[PDB]
Structure formats: structure tokens, C-alpha cells
Amino acid sequence: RELATLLHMKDLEIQDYQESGATLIRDRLKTEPFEENSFLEQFMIEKLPEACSIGDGKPFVMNLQDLYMAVTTQ
Amino acid sequence: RELATLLHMKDLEIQDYQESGATLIRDRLKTEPFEENSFLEQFMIEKLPEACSIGDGKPFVMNLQDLYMAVTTQ
Amino acid sequence: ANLFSDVQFKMSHKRIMLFTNEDNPHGNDSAKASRARTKAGDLRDTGIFLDLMHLKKPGGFDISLFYRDIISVHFEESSKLEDLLRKVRAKETRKRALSRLKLKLNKDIVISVGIYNLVQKALKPPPIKLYRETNEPVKTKT
């Protein structure tokens, strides 16, 4: 949620440029405006299967231990 | 992760706007360039005491039951 | 860019070949690199293409580092430079109409046909007669 509100702050900033001049130079830096629902949808379709795969418990011990210890502390 | 990288790409777009686009804004929407390390340290220092709160299970059953369902299916 | 601008004959295609492997031209002065994108984008819009073949480097063999926005996955050597050693002696002529003739179905219906050539049996280029010491042209006068 917080990263999303940040991306909407950024969308506000970018639209501020877009309302008055500010043409893009690098023709490959375009970003579509951020709206959660559609990306949650594409997350569901394209990458939710690979993501939510339980596997052998490796990704959990790999990446989440920081948050694990943090949540245990809190 | 993906939302952080979207944050970085929108950082790249805003940079394309200021450093080479030769344009400015109203200065009321300027957002800090995104880095996930700080973002995480601040989330876990400030928001985390309430971000991981178990509570009555009320917020759980409201906020994510959709994702719950989806990952059960997957 | 100035070099292309200088010469007077009209140019059909305009290509620039870099030869470098410092895949980041400078990670030290960002202003130089910003001006680099600007000028390169200009050249892309003045009618000039640009191209690098990643020759060879210990590590540092990537194109997304500052060049994904310049040229038109990756490795330490370019296949694109190997063919530039294929060392051929062909010769070519462009879309050269041998003769345009008006195909007429009858005495009234006429259509415009370009008789073109697709095989020609190239001969050796015709030799030129030169003076014995002075190597000058001799301007035959039969």
C-alpha cells in the first residue's frame, strides 16, 4: 500500500510534467500510469503461479528471514 | 519487489524530465528517488508495529481473502 | 556528425561504426553522459544511424549499460563483427531500370512496365590504357 501511494505521488509528479511541455527524450523510458487493480490482475495471471509455488521452502529461508525476525520481534 | 522496480522506473522517467527534458514542475509534488533499503528501514521502524498486527483477525479476513482464494486455487 | 555534414554528394545511407569495449563510457561525470544521450538522439534524428560491435573485454560485455538507448542478449564478442571479415568481392547496382517500355494489351490499352534485370553475367571491369612511365590516361583517338 505504501509503495503504491508513493507511485501515485510519482504519477502526480509525472503528470505535472505532462500537463506543460516536458517531452520524453529516451523513447524507451515510458511508464504507464499506476493503478493497482490491473497490476494485481496481471500478477494473478502471469506470475502468481510461479510466485506462490511452495517448493521446498528454499525461497522463504532465502528472502523472508529479515521480515521473519522483525515480525517475531514486534 | 515489482512495485519497487516500478518506483525505480518512474524515478528514471522523472529524471529524464528534469536532467535532459529541460522542464520543471509546480514544486509541490516532488517525490524522493526510490530506494528499497531506506524504504524498508523506515517501514520497519515506523509502520511495522501496526503493519503486522494480528488483532481480531478482522483485518486479515478483509484485506487479503481474495489473494487467499487465488493462492488456494493455484 | 560534422564529417557527414561536410561532403557534398548526396548520401543514400549513413552509418557510424564505433569500436570500443568500455561499455560505460564514463561512470564518473554524469553530465558528460547526459550530453551524450542528447547529442546521440539528435544524430538519430538528423538521419544518421549509429552502431557498435562489442569487441572484447574481461567482464564489461553488456549493452544495457548506457548503450541500449544508442544503437538500433550479450556476450564478450560480437558476431556482428565476424561477418565484416567475410572478405567478399561482389559488386552491386541499385534498383536500376534497364528500360521502361509501355506494355499495350491491344492498340488502345497500354500499361507501364519496367524491364528490370535479375542476372547479368558480370565481366571484369574494362581496363584503361595507360602511358608506360607516366601512368597517365592516354585518351584513344581512333
Name the DSSP class of B17.
I
Cα–Cα distance, B74 to B67 (Å, whole number): 10
CB contact under 8 Å between C38 and A25, yes or no, is yes
Cα(B9)–Cα(A7) distance, rounded to whole angstroms? 10
Q: Which of C28, C41, C33 is nearest to C71 (CA)?
A: C41
CB contact under 8 A, A28 and C38: no
Which residues lie across from C64 on neighbouring strands? Answer: none
- Please indicate whether, in this complex, the C-beta atoms of A13 and B25 are within 8 angstroms of each other: yes
List of chain A residues whose C-beta atoms are within 8 Å of the C-beta of residue C38: 25
Could you tell me whether strands C49-52 and C110-115 are parallel, antiparallel, or unpaired per DSSP bridges? unpaired
Query: Please, which contacts does C81-90 make with residues 24 or more away whose CB atoms are closer than 8 Å?
Result: C81/C53, C81/C55, C84/C53
In Å, how far are A21, B27, C56, C97 from C117, measured between CA atoms?
52, 66, 43, 8
Longest dimension (CA), chain C: 76
Mapping DSSP onto H, E and C, the string for chain A reads: CHHHHHHHHHHHHHHHHHHCCCCCCCCCCCCCCCCHHHHHHHHHHHHHHHHHCCCCCHHHHHHCHHHHHHHHHC
φ and ψ of C53, to 5 deg: -105, 125
Say if CB B38 and CB B32 are below 8 A apart. no
In whole angstroms, what is the distance from residue A52 CA to residue B64 CA? 14
> With 0-12 CB in 10 A as exposed, 13-18 as middle and 19+ as buried, what is B17?
buried
Q: Please list, in sequence order, all residues whose beta carbon lies within 8 angstroms of the beta carbon of residue C34, skipping any fewer than 6 positions away.
A: B19, B20
- Nearest residue of B to residue C31 by CA position? B19
Interface size A-B, in CB pairs within 8 Å, comes to 87
**Residue A47 φ/ψ, nearest 5 degrees:** -135, -10
Task: Indicate the helix (H) or strand (E) that contains C79.
Answer: helix C79-82
Experimental method: cryo-EM
Q: Are B14 and B34 in contact (CB under 8 A)?
A: no
* Cell triple for A5: 501511494
Helix axes of B2-15 and A2-19: crossing angle, nearest 10 degrees: 20
Among residues C68, C67, C50, C53, which one has the least CA distance to residue C13? C50
- Classify residue B35 as left (phi > 0), alpha (psi -120 to 50) or beta: beta
Task: Residue C69: list chain A partners with CB under 8 A.
Answer: 26-28
Rounded to whole angstroms, the Cα distance separating A34 from A38 reads 9
Chain C residues close to B19, C-beta within 8 Å: 34
Q: Which of C1, C41, B39 is nearest to A29 (CA)?
A: C41
- For chain B, the farthest-separated pair of C-alpha atoms sits apart, in whole angstroms, at 53
Q: Give the distance, in angstroms, between the CA of residue A24 and the centroid of all CA atoms in the same chain.
A: 23
Residue C56 CA from chain centroid, whole number: 23
Residue C135 vs residues C32, C39, C126, C130, C139: alpha-carbon distances, Å: 51, 47, 17, 5, 12
Residue environment code for B32-49, b if the CB has 16+ CB neighbours within 10 A, otherwise e: eebeeeebeeebbeeebe
Burial of A7 (0-12, 13-18, 19+ CB in 10 A): buried
Torsion sign across C-alpha atoms A52, A56, A58, A64? positive
